[PDB]
């Protein structure tokens, strides 16, 4: 599913991501924009052989199981395929664990490089929330 901008903001809020660990909704929408362009089915293969999955490009080295990432963990206790669903529940619950891991949203390098320090509120501007 490719979400609309405000549609995704609303879904993220419904699932308790708004201001989670102090990160406003615009931060999460911005991260999703640059990680996946709002496409739940986004996948990308990393140089280390791990893969990133879903709207927030969650990585199989630590967070989910895909059966093809040697020496990896599955800390969210989910198949990576769950992160591709039109229902963002699994991605949100896993993101909550990731952002609580110590480095906040810096875990998403694209958030650090493209969202951090910017006017992230623009991502939810106009949205009925
Ligand atoms: Cl915001
Ligand atoms: Cl594996
Ligand atoms: Cl980047």
From Swiss-Prot:
Tissues/organs with expression: In the egg white and polymorphonuclear leukocytes.
Disulfide bonds: 6-127, 30-115, 64-80, 76-94
Residue stretches making up the C-type lysozyme domain: 1-129
UniProt subcellular location: Secreted
Catalytic site positions: 35, 52
Sequence positions that bind substrate: 101
InterPro entries: Glyco_hydro_22, Glyco_hydro_22_CS, Glyco_hydro_22_lys, Lysozyme-like_dom_sf
PROSITE patterns: GLYCOSYL_HYDROL_F22_1, GLYCOSYL_HYDROL_F22_2
Top enzyme class: hydrolase
Reaction(s) catalysed by this chain's protein: Hydrolysis of (1->4)-beta-linkages between N-acetylmuramic acid and N-acetyl-D-glucosamine residues in a peptidoglycan and between N-acetyl-D-glucosamine residues in chitodextrins
Pfam family, one: Lys
Cellular compartments per GO CC: cytoplasm; endoplasmic reticulum; extracellular space
SMART domains the record matches: LYZ1 (SM00263)
GO biological process: cell wall macromolecule catabolic process; defense response to bacterium; defense response to Gram-negative bacterium; defense response to Gram-positive bacterium; killing of cells of another organism
EC annotation from Swiss-Prot or TrEMBL: 3.2.1.17
Subunit structure, interactors included: Monomer.
Protein family (similarity comment): Belongs to the glycosyl hydrolase 22 family.
Protein known as: Lysozyme C
Organism: Gallus gallus
Taxonomic classification: Eukaryota, Metazoa, Chordata, Craniata, Vertebrata
């Amino acid at each position: 599913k490719v979400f609309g901008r405000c549609e995704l903001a609303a879904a993220m809020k419904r699932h308790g991501l708004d201001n989670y660990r102090g990160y406003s909704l615009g931060n999460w929408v911005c991260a999703a924009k640059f990680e996946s362009n709002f496409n739940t089915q986004a996948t990308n293969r990393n140089t280390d052989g791990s893969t990133d999955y879903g709207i927030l490009q969650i990585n199989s080295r630590w967070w989910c199981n895909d059966g093809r990432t040697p020496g990896s963990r599955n800390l969210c206790n989910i198949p990576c395929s769950a992160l591709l669903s039109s229902d963002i529940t699994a991605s949100v619950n896993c993101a909550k664990k990731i952002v609580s891991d110590g480095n906040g949203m810096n875990a998403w390098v694209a958030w650090r490089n493209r969202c951090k320090g910017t006017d992230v509120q623009a991502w939810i501007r106009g949205c009925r929330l």
